[PDB]
Ligand binder design. Structure first.
Ligand code: DGD
Ligand code: CLA
Ligand code: CLA
Ligand code: CLA
Ligand code: CLA
Ligand code: CLA
Ligand code: CLA
Ligand code: MGE
Ligand code: MGE
Ligand code: MGE
Ligand code: OEC
Ligand code: BR
Ligand code: BR
Ligand code: FE2
Lengths: 36, 37, 30, 49, 98, 137, 335, 35, 170, 191, 242, 36
């Protein structure tokens, strides 16, 4: 159809920026005990 | 320049992220079509 | 876009520059 | 498509090969003589279509 | 409803097989003998010719030059003057060398 | 056994009679040339004015004909434009050339007669790379 | 007590400050910043510039030539050649724009400033006891860039032909060159390659061998690049353990025995030729171009037997003709 | 425009002077020690 | 030249890295080279460094600390750990040099980096838009039309004087 | 050497073109001059002759509003010499003097400097980068310009050389630093 | 009395002669003797482009442009017999003379508008009946306006007229039935009008200075974007002669 | 211009997927000592 060439870019980001935020603070946590 | 005490450790649990992840990814499903218009 | 896309990736290298000449983690002498 | 002229000889269009992303349209009948070609320089054009 | 290359479309007429006493760059007068140096300068320093013979006229010709003209006439020709073909003093140095 | 005497056999005058050159005297036509014309007429083309070349065809079509030894010699003696009148010795160094651009002062018949040959001879050598500068090469 | 200036003069030369602001720096920084920020902007929104004389502006840029490889900072215009075009001349900043004005201002700056870096690159060589010739290895650098920004211009008419700053402009600038100076047919340009094509060859070695010879400090628990805590006066890598190899690769006598005669050789290769190149271009900015063998090789009758370098001629004549089309009305390019 | 000229020159000047006048007093001594 | 012509190699991301390697690697080869000759100590007598300690005896000629603060104050950032400075000297070239090698395979299938669509299209319909890119791009045609024939003999090129592209007056 | 190499490259007087060669610029002007003349004679009007760029085929204005040869030769408008000056006027080239005062000799001098230009080849081959093997002259002005530069250049790196080390004698760094008291080991390391 | 040097690099060598303040006597004519004017000089002050408003019934305006091109805007040293017709008027024509002078300006917006300020051909016609060129006398006539570039100018991609690539070569299989606009580059010619009004003359010499105007059209750029209208005015100068 | 409506997403991501990867392995690292 006739979608907003960037609607996808916004969804993709908005699902990484916020999401990654957690795959960041989480990981640093398990390493609170010299682990991956 | 002596180190800082007001620097507690940053808090986040292996399941809190999951509760967050769910809320975040799905939030997107909904709110995503409304982007593609 | 692009015109912007290009400026950004740049205004960044300037950041990552500021971060390495001042938040350099001191070389220790032991 | 076969190209001809007043005379009527069957000219042949020299083709573009691999390397070239651009080519100059040169027409050579059989035996291989240049008989027509779209000229970049128009003033001393001899074979020009 | 279409536009066309002004120059090269002239190639389908007189100028483009002979010499157009009204346009062709001056340097095509070497193509025959006893014509370049002077006659050439004259042929052009004179306005377009409504007819190929009008050449012999040009005020100042020595019967010899009026002659050469006659025997080379058969090679001369004329057609509509062409603005893009001779504006920029192209007639003399049509901007183009060897 | 590549540059045959029958190729060094050129037209010296108008009438159509002919003269032969030595594998020797030819050399001189070159040596002289570069000394005397290099500046221009390199590869066979006039740099001061590209509308005029040294090719054979052209020469013959010149007037007086310049497709023969005596003719080019005429030139080297008295320079004139294509087509009749207008003595251009005051510009084109030529034996007349009032020693102006002295390169001419020395040369003699042995010299001009040779150079000339180097002129009709060359094209027979170089396809016609003799007339068109740059485009060939 | 010392008055306030005697302080200034210590602050500027203080071996303490995060980054030394040596005297040279007092002209380096102010300069360098001028340039950069100027460039940095006109690389974004650069009004259509008209290098070659003819009024036919060719402005690669972003806010026009929306790309990174495309755009660049376009040169000065023949019009005002080798002439100093001080922004404050253009009766309108818009005029100072049409005529490449932004170029100069930047160039002269980055030029002189780099000269300043050159100098203030030794100010520590002295302000801190140690051999002064570091700044000297920076000669090969500077000089070059000078050769491609100032020399060629002074050499020919105007800056109009002075290494346009931008990816593709480089190439243009280059290709032109190769077509007006057989610069690939130079025993000078050779020397840039000669060394550059060496340093690459050698950086691989000393980097190779050195790393190829490291004691034993961790056993893949973590990495091997820890076999050196900074400051230690030991030498994490083994010298003779090292040579034992290269001496064994190419017969001995051929591999380096003394370590100091080694590291030097590493400035020896680069700098030595990178200079030459720097000279090469700087040489041709006066027209003493690469070798001419066009036709050279002949036949008996006289037919022309082709030299490889004859081919090189066409790929040259080709670019030769097309470059700066419609910008010159005569047959000889004397610049 | 012209007004800018001078502003620019001044600056340039103000500095060189700083460069020259500066590099002068207390220099051949500007190092760790002289042996 | 061949490549600059029908391939326009100079515009390829890869090759532009090979360049990155072959340059920096040389920069290193020298930054460090003379970074050394001007750091080391007086651990020999005379005014020449050749007799200076070695061969592997006393430890280290250049104090990686005294040199350090030299750059960390001039060019802003310097090293630490000659262990990596000796393995980053390897990377740089051996690295970038591999890059190009890839791109080059790309030229095999003529699959190269020649055009910038966004450009030719914006160029096509506007006799007033010129970028270096286009300029360079014209060279190619030149360095090709004149070449190819006497360069690719087996494909009997027949090139009339007209046909052949070339600026005005040259 | 620099303030030298330049003198030969540009100067017309202390470096007469008659003993040495025709200064680069002088060469470029010789070009137009020539074809301006070759052409005016063919009956053309340089005064009004319109360029192909739309600028001026033989002549055009300068940022000073003066007249100067056209094409690319504009790059060398500042150049001056005895063979052109008289064919010059009060506002730059003079359309009058340029039409008839065009004395005969100048056309040829104006020619020689065209054929013979400050361009050549290492192995002495006069002519643009890609000229057949025939003339072989390489201008002296070209030779003195290049030469000196290489020299005057190196020297600048030669002055660095000593003026920088000799700063270490009156300082004693020349021979390296002292294995025990390295001046940076007694400095408040910025980090 | 001043040499090419005095003026070299001044910024006036582009400025016509200023007919010495105070001197309004006029120059008498004959018909028993023919006159010519040694030099015609047209120096400008300002250029104006007519705005192309999107709207229709709200008249076109003449906005001012800034001289981008470094001062190269004058036409000095022109001529072509000053004839007197069976009337009372003087009809001045033209021959040699540097009458072209491609210059550009930057319109209000970010736009760049270029033209070639010329008087090529020009035909001067004075007030129907004059005996001596009295202040405020005039000339208003025509002149041709060629093209900003000879038939040979080659645009970015190969293309052109006299001798340029045929039609956009970077793209082969793309339909051209649209590009035609830029593929085929035609060269245009249209005439324009000037108009001189005097305001000073040295009846002894013939030096007649004043102001002028001219309305020629901008650049056609071969087959491209329809021109723009440009009004141009400045001071001028010409000095009669027998 | 007439670029690739998805040159973006392509770019932007390639500078986030990898990049963010480091901000991840790095971050957990300073947590090897109960810190942010
Ligand atoms: C104003 C602020 C600018 C600050 C600059 C910041 C950058 C500084 C970095 C290095 C220092 C540069 C200092 C100025 C460089 C001048 C370069 C130049 O093009 O100068 C312009 C002049 C002009 O000379 C020519 O002079 C000619 C005069 O002759 C003409 O006119 C004459 C008189 O009528 C005669 O008629 C004659 O026949 C005719 O040819 C014309 O006027 C020309 O237009 C004109 O170009 O040349 C000369 O001054 C040459 C001789 C003196 C100048 C210096 C010589 C060489 C310097 C090179 C150093 C850089 C090398 C890199 C370093 C490598 C590692 C460090
Ligand atoms: C001021 C002089 C100058 C500068 C700054 C550059 C810079 C560059 N050239 Mg280059 N070049 C120059 C002169 C210069 N060149 C000259 C005189 C020639 C011959 C005439 C060339 C021929 C050439 C070729 C063939 C190529 C380049 C390429 C490049 C780029 C990659 C080089 C690289 O990998 O680093 C080598 C090692 C380094 C340590 C340099 C990297 C570190 C910094 C300096 C990168 C550049 C930073 C940038 C210029 C500035 C950004 C920040 C801002 C403040 C300027 C880089 C932008 C390549 C390219 O594709 O463009 C990117 C490429 O293929 N150049
Ligand atoms: C073998 C090495 C070598 C050779 C053969 C030459 C040869 C020459 N140099 Mg020279 N030069 C050299 C190395 C060399 N140089 C070096 C390493 C430098 C330092 C950069 C110079 C700097 C230099 C300058 C500045 C000049 C020359 C000039 C000359 C020419 C004049 C001869 C001379 O001046 O008599 C001596 C007497 C004369 C009357 C000649 C000119 C008198 C003025 C120029 C002297 C002013 C002082 C000057 C610094 C002294 C120059 C001596 C030096 C060249 C040996 C001559 C061809 C002159 C010329 O103009 O060349 C283009 C000139 O002006 N040279
Ligand atoms: C000016 C900037 C610049 C830089 C830094 C480079 C850098 C490079 N170019 Mg390049 N290039 C440039 C400009 C530049 N180019 C320009 C302007 C053009 C024209 C458009 C090109 C056209 C070009 C082409 C066609 C190629 C390159 C290639 C290369 C790479 C090859 C380097 C190499 O290691 O050779 C060394 C070459 C080798 C084969 C190494 C092995 C040699 C053997 C192992 C040594 C044997 C020696 C033997 C034992 C001793 C015998 C000697 C005998 C005489 C006695 C290198 C990254 C090459 C490439 O990218 O590689 C894939 C390549 O094919 N370039
Ligand atoms: C020390 C650092 C430094 C250096 C070396 C330079 C150097 C340069 N700058 Mg620059 N600049 C600097 C800092 C510096 N700048 C700063 C901080 C700014 C902020 C604006 C600028 C802004 C700037 C602009 C806008 C321009 C430059 C330009 C230049 C170049 C021309 C300079 C020149 O015309 O000198 C001329 C003057 C001298 C060399 C010294 C003369 C000293 C004067 C004569 C004495 C003072 C006169 C005073 C007593 C009388 C007037 C009184 C009056 C106020 C009433 C040159 C490379 C120009 C450029 O390069 O291209 C045009 C240019 O346009 N600069
Ligand atoms: C394999 C093929 C090959 C190779 C190996 C080379 C190699 C080289 N070519 Mg080359 N070339 C080739 C083919 C090749 N070319 C072909 C086919 C052509 C035809 C066009 C050319 C045309 C050509 C030209 C016109 C030039 C070269 C030049 C060079 C040299 C440039 C590198 C140098 O000397 O650094 C020297 C340069 C520097 C050290 C730069 C100075 C340092 C400045 C300050 C960098 C600025 C950094 C920046 C401001 C960053 C700021 C902060 C940042 C850190 C963030 C190099 C030796 C250049 C040359 O040799 O002159 C020097 C040159 O001008 N080539
Ligand atoms: C694969 C085999 C091969 C060989 C043997 C060479 C050899 C050479 N190339 Mg080369 N080249 C190659 C492949 C090769 N190339 C490929 C695939 C490309 C892609 C484009 C290039 C692109 C290229 C460019 C652009 C240039 C060269 C140049 C050179 C010469 C300079 C040498 C140099 O600077 O190295 C530095 C030295 C080392 C890296 C260490 C070894 C040095 C060699 C092996 C010895 C050289 C000595 C020589 C053989 C004779 C000297 C005798 C004496 C030493 C006793 C050299 C003859 C330069 C040239 O102009 O020729 C002189 C030059 O500008 N090459
Ligand atoms: C197309 C579908 C997309 C839409 C999504 C579907 C709707 C999802 C609704 C459920 C979300 C509510 C979660 C309650 C929070 C909580 O309490 O569960 C936490 C996380 O569990 C979760 O997030 C797990 C999420 C996955 C559950 C989905 C089950 C699939 C169907 C099962 C069918 C069985 C036959 C785990 O514990 C929590 O977190 C602990 C810390 O780790 C703390 O103890 C807290 O107090 C709390 O207990
Ligand atoms: C599927 C469709 C159905 C409807 C949607 C279902 C999803 C419902 C989930 C929401 C439950 C209640 C509200 C959530 C709060 C919560 O959950 O709180 C945190 C969860 O993670 C979190 O999310 C923490 C908040 C971080 C959000 C990051 C995304 C925002 C983008 C950042 C952009 C930066 C530029 C964890 O709670 C904490 O739990 C412990 C820490 O782990 C603490 O002790 C406290 O109890 C604290 O409350
Ligand atoms: C538009 C411009 C965009 C293009 C970019 C510009 C080109 C950049 C080239 C420089 C990268 C090489 C880095 C060497 C690696 C290294 O050794 O420095 C490391 C990281 O430093 C860095 O990465 C810092 C990067 C920022 C430096 C830029 C300086 C700005 C200009 C200064 C001008 C001064 C007047 C720090 O130490 C390293 O990492 C240490 C661990 O932290 C280990 O000790 C290693 O052995 C090693 O020493
Ligand atoms: Mn760009 Ca050195 Mn090729 Mn004339 Mn200009
Ligand atoms: Br170009
Ligand atoms: Br020209
Ligand atoms: Fe090392």
């Amino acid at each position: 159809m006739e979608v907003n060439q960037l609607g996808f870019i916004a969804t993709a980001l908005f699902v990484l920026v916020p999401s990654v935020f957690l795959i960041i603070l989480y990981v640093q946590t398990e390493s609170q005990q010299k682990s991956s | 320049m002596e180190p800082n005490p007001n620097r507690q450790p940053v808090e986040l649990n292996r399941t809190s992220l999951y509760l967050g992840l769910l809320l975040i990814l799905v939030l997107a499903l909904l709110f995503s079509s409304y982007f593609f218009n | 876009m692009e015109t912007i896309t290009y400026v950004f990736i740049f205004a960044c290298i300037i950041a990552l520059f500021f971060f390495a000449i001042f938040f350099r983690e001191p070389p220790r002498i032991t | 498509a076969v190209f001809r002229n007043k005379e009527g000889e069957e000219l042949f269009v020299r083709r573009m090969p691999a390397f070239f992303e651009s080519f100059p349209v040169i027409l050579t009948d059989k035996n291989g003589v240049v008989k027509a070609d779209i000229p970049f320089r128009r003033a001393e054009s001899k074979y020009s279509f | 409803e279409e536009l066309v290359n002004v120059v090269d479309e002239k190639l389908g007429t007189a100028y483009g097989e002979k010499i157009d006493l009204n346009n062709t760059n001056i340097a095509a007068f070497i193509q025959y003998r006893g014509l370049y140096p002077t006659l050439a300068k004259l042929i052009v320093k004179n306005a377009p010719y409504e007819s190929v013979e009008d050449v012999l006229n040009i005020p100042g010709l020595t019967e010899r030059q009026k002659q050469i003209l006659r025997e080379n006439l058969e090679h001369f020709t004329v057609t509509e003057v062409e603005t893009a073909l001779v504006e920029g003093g192209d007639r003399y140095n049509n901007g183009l060398y060897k | 056994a590549e540059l045959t005497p029958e190729v060094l056999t050129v037209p010296l005058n108008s009438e159509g009679k002919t003269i032969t050159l030595t594998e020797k005297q030819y050399l001189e036509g070159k040596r002289l040339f570069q000394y005397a014309c290099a500046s221009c007429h390199v590869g066979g083309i006039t740099k001061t004015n590209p509308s005029l070349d040294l090719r054979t065809e052209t020469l013959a079509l010149a007037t007086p004909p310049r497709d023969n030894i005596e003719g080019l010699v005429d030139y080297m003696k008295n320079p004139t434009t294509y087509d009749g009148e207008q003595e251009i010795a005051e510009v084109h160094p030529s034996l007349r050339s009032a020693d102006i651009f002295p390169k001419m002062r020395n040369l003699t018949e042995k010299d001009l007669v040779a150079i000339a040959g180097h002129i009709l001879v060359e094209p027979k050598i170089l396809g016609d790379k003799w007339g068109g500068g740059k485009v060939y090469y | 007590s010392a008055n306030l200036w005697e302080r200034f003069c210590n602050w500027v030369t203080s071996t303490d400050n995060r980054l030394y602001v040596g005297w040279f720096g007092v002209i380096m920084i102010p300069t360098l910043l001028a340039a950069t920020i100027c460039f940095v902007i006109a690389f974004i929104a650069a009004p259509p510039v008209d290098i070659d004389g003819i009024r036919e502006p060719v402005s690669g840029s972003l806010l026009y030539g929306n790309n990174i490889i495309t755009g660049a900072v376009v040169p000065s215009s023949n019009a005002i050649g080798l002439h100093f075009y001080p922004i404050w001349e253009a009766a309108s900043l818009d005029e100072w724009l049409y005529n490449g004005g932004p170029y100069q201002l930047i160039i002269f700056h980055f030029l002189l400033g780099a000269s300043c870096y050159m100098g203030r690159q030794w100010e520590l060589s002295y302000r801190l006891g140690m051999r002064p010739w570091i700044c000297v290895a920076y000669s090969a650098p500077l000089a070059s860039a000078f050769a491609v920004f100032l020399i060629y211009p002074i050499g020919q008419g105007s800056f109009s032909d002075g290494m346009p700053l931008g990816i593709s402009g480089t190439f243009n600038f280059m290709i032109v060159f190769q077509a007006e100076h057989n610069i690939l047919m130079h025993p000078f340009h050779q020397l840039g390659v000669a060394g550059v094509f060496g340093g690459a060859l050698f950086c691989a070695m000393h980097g190779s061998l050195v790393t190829s010879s490291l004691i034993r400090e961790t056993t893949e628990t973590e990495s091997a690049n820890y076999g050196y805590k900074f400051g230690q006066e030991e030498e994490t890598y083994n010298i003779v353990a090292a040579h034992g190899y290269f001496g064994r690769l190419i017969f001995q006598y051929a591999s380096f025995n003394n370590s100091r005669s080694l590291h030097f050789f590493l400035a020896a290769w680069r700098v030595v030729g990178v200079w030459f190149a720097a000279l090469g271009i700087s040489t041709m900015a006066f027209n003493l171009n690469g070798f001419n063998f066009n036709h050279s090789v002949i036949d008996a009758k006289g037919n022309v037997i082709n030299t490889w370098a004859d081919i090189i001629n066409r790929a040259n004549l080709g670019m030769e003709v097309m470059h700066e089309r419609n910008a010159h009305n005569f047959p000889l390019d004397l610049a | 425009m012209e007004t800018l000229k001078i502003t620019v020159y001044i600056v340039v000047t103000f500095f060189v002077l700083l460069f020259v006048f500066g590099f002068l007093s207390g220099d051949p001594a500007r190092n760790p020690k002289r042996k | 030249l061949f490549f600059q012509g029908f391939h326009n190699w100079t515009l390829n991301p890869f090759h532009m890295m090979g360049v990155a390697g072959v340059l920096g690697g040389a920069l290193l080869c020298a930054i460090h080279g003379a970074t050394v000759e001007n750091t080391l100590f007086q651990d020999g007598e005379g005014a020449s460094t050749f007799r200076a300690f070695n061969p592997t005896q006393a430890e280290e000629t250049y104090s990686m600390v005294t040199a350090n603060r030299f750059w960390s104050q001039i060019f802003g950032i310097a090293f630490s750990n000659k262990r990596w400075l000796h393995f980053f000297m390897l990377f740089v070239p051996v690295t970038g040099l591999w890059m190009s090698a890839i791109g080059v395979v790309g030229l095999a299938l003529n699959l190269r980096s020649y055009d910038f669509i966004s450009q030719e299209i914006r160029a096509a319909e506007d006799p007033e838009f010129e970028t270096f890119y286009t300029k360079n791009l014209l060279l190619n045609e030149g360095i090709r039309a004149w070449m190819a024939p006497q360069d690719q003999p087996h494909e009997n090129f027949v090139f009339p004087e007209e046909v052949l592209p070339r600026g005005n007056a040259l | 050497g620099f303030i030298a190499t330049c003198f030969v490259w540009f100067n017309n007087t202390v470096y007469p073109s008659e003993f040495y060669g025709p200064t680069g610029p002088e060469a470029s002007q010789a070009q137009a001059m020539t074809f301006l003349i070759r052409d005016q004679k063919l009956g053309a009007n340089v005064g009004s002759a319109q360029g192909p760029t739309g600028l001026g085929k033989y002549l055009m204005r300068s940022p000073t509003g003066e007249i100067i040869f056209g094409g690319e030769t504009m790059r060398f408008w500042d150049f001056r010499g005895p063979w052109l000056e008289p064919l010059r006027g009060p506002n730059g080239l003079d359309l009058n003097k340029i039409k008839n005062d065009i004395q005969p000799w100048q056309e040829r001098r104006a020619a020689e400097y065209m054929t013979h230009a400050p361009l050549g080849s290492l192995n002495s081959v006069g002519g643009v980068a890609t000229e057949i093997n025939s003339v072989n002259f390489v201008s002296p002005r070209s030779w003195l310009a290049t030469s000196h530069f290489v020299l005057a250049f190196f020297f600048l790196v030669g002055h660095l050389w000593h003026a920088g080390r000799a700063r270490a004698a009156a300082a004693g760094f020349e021979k390296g630093i002292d294995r025990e008291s390295e001046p940076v080991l007694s400095m408040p390391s910025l980090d | 009395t001043l040499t090419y040097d005095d003026i070299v690099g001044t910024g006036l060598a582009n400025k016509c002669p200023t007919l010495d303040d105070t001197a309004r006597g006029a120059y008498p004519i004959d018909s028993s003797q023919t006159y010519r004017i040694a030099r015609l000089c047209l120096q400008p002050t300002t250029f104006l482009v007519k705005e192309e408003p999107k709207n229709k019934r709200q008249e076109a305006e003449f906005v001012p442009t800034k001289l981008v091109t470094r001062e190269t805007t004058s036409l000095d040293q022109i001529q072509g017999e000053l004839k007197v017709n069976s009337d009372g008027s003087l009809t001045f024509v033209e021959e040699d003379g540097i009458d072209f002078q491609p210059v550009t300006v930057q319109m209000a917006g970010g736009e760049r508008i270029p033209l070639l300020f010329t008087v090529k051909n020009l035909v001067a016609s004075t007030q129907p009946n004059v005996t001596s060129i009295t202040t405020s006398t005039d000339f208003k006539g025509e002149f041709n306006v060629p093209s900003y570039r000879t038939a040979n100018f080659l645009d970015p991609k190969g293309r052109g007229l006299a001798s340029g690539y045929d039609s956009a070569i970077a793209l082969p299989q793309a339909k051209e039935e649209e590009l035609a606009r830029a593929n085929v580059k035609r060269f245009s010619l249209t005439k324009g009008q000037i108009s001189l009004n005097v305001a000073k003359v040295d009846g002894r010499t013939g030096e007649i200075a004043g102001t002028f105007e001219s309305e020629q059209l901008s650049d056609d750029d071969m087959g491209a974007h329809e021109p723009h209208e440009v009004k141009i005015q400045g001071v001028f100068y010409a000095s009669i002669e027998p």
